[PDB]
Design a protein around this ligand. Structure first.
Ligand SMILES: C[C@@H](CCO)[C@@H]1NC(=O)[C@H](C[C@@](C)(O)CO)NC1=O
Ligand SMILES: O=C(O)CCC(=O)C(=O)O
Ligand SMILES: [Cl-]
Ligand SMILES: [Fe+2]
Length: 280
C-alpha cells in the first residue's frame, strides 16, 4: 500500500536517476523522489508551514493569516481556508520580495531554480525541440513562468478528507513533506507516498499532461490526495505554471510532433477550472 518510487538527484548533467529504465518509469508514473541539496536550508519554510495560520500573536510568521486575497488583487493568493481539512497561504513570485519574509523569498528562489533544472531534463527527454521550450512551458523552461510558493496546514479537528483527490495545474510541483498522508493513485489503486525528509516529492501537473498528450510517451499528471489527518500536518510546495498574471497570460499548449504548439486554453483559466473541480 506504499508506492515504490524512483529516487533522483540533480547532478552535473541534469536529473540523474539510477539508470535509463528508472528514469523512464519515474516519468511514466508521473511522480518520483528528488534528493534535497545538502546546502539547502528548509527550516524557515518548515516553520512558516507550522505558523502561517495562527495569527499575529505567533512570531515570526503567524501574521500571514491576516493577508486575504483582497490584499493582492488576485483571488488565488493569500490565506485560504478550504472545504477540506487544508488551509493554505499561497503567493506568486511577483509578490515574494515585497510580501514574504526575506528568508522565505530566498527559499522560493532556490526552489524556482531547482525546478527549472528538473523541467528542462523532462522537456529534453520528451523530444520537444529546444526553441519551442519557452512558449511550451509558458516561461518555465527559463525563469519566466508563474511560481507559487504555497504553505499547507491540515486542521485535524475538521471531519474532512485532508485534501481531495486532484491533479496540480502546472508543469512541475516540488513538494516538501515530512509526515505521512500523501497518497497517489497509480493504476487505479491508492498508495501512500513514502516519507523521506531528505527528499522532495516531484510530480507533474495538468499542463505537463496536456503538453505531452500527443507525444509518443505521454506524461501524466498524477492523481493524488491527502488522507484524513487525526493529528495536525503541514507541508509546502513550489508550483511552476505557465505565466498566469491577470492581463499577461501565456497560454497552455499541446505539442503536435513534427508540427508545433497548438493553444489549448489559458493558464489562469486552467487554474480556476481545476480549483473549482478539486473542491466542488
Ligand atoms: C497555481 C497554484 C494554485 C492557485 O489556486 C498552485 N497550483 C496547484 O495546482 C495547487 C492547487 C491546490 C491543491 O493546492 C490549492 O488548494 N497549489 C498551488 O499553489
Ligand atoms: O500536503 C501535501 O502533501 C500535498 C499538498 C498538495 O497536494 C497541494 O497543495 O497541491
Ligand atoms: Cl481555522
Ligand atoms: Fe497537489
Amino acid at each position: 500500500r506504499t508506492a515504490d518510487l524512483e529516487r533522483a538527484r540533480l547532478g552535473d548533467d541534469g536529473l540523474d536517476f539510477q539508470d535509463d529504465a528508472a528514469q523512464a518509469r519515474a516519468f511514466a508514473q508521473g511522480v518520483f523522489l528528488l534528493e534535497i541539496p545538502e546546502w539547502l536550508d528548509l527550516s524557515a519554510g518548515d516553520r512558516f508551514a507550522r505558523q502561517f495560520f495562527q495569527g499575529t500573536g505567533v512570531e515570526p510568521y503567524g501574521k500571514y493569516r491576516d493577508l486575504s486575497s483582497e490584499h493582492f488583487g488576485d483571488e488565488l493568493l493569500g490565506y485560504h481556508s478550504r472545504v477540506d481539512q487544508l488551509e493554505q497561504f499561497l503567493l506568486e513570485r511577483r509578490f515574494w520580495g515585497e510580501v514574504y519574509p526575506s528568508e522565505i523569498a530566498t527559499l522560493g528562489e532556490h526552489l524556482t531554480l531547482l525546478s527549472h533544472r528538473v523541467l528542462r531534463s523532462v522537456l529534453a527527454s520528451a523530444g520537444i525541440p529546444e526553441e519551442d521550450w519557452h512558449r511550451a512551458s509558458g516561461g518555465c523552461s527559463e525563469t519566466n513562468g508563474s511560481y507559487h510558493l504555497t504553505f499547507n496546514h491540515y486542521r485535524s479537528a475538521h471531519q474532512d478528507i485532508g485534501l481531495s483527490s486532484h491533479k496540480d495545474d502546472g508543469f512541475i510541483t516540488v513538494l516538501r513533506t515530512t509526515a505521512q498522508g500523501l497518497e497517489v493513485n497509480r493504476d487505479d489503486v491508492w498508495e501512500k507516498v513514502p516519507v523521506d525528509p531528505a527528499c522532495f516529492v516531484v510530480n507533474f501537473g495538468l499542463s505537463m499532461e496536456i503538453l505531452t498528450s500527443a507525444c509518443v510517451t505521454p506524461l501524466s499528471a498524477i492523481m493524488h490526495r491527502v488522507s484524513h489527518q487525526n493529528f495536525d500536518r503541514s507541508s509546502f510546495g513550489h508550483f511552476s505554471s505557465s505565466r498566469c498574471l491577470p492581463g499577461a497570460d501565456d497560454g497552455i499548449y499541446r505539442y503536435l510532433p513534427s508540427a508545433g504548439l497548438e493553444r489549448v486554453c489559458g493558464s489562469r483559466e486552467l487554474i480556476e477550472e481545476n480549483d473549482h473541480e478539486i473542491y466542488m
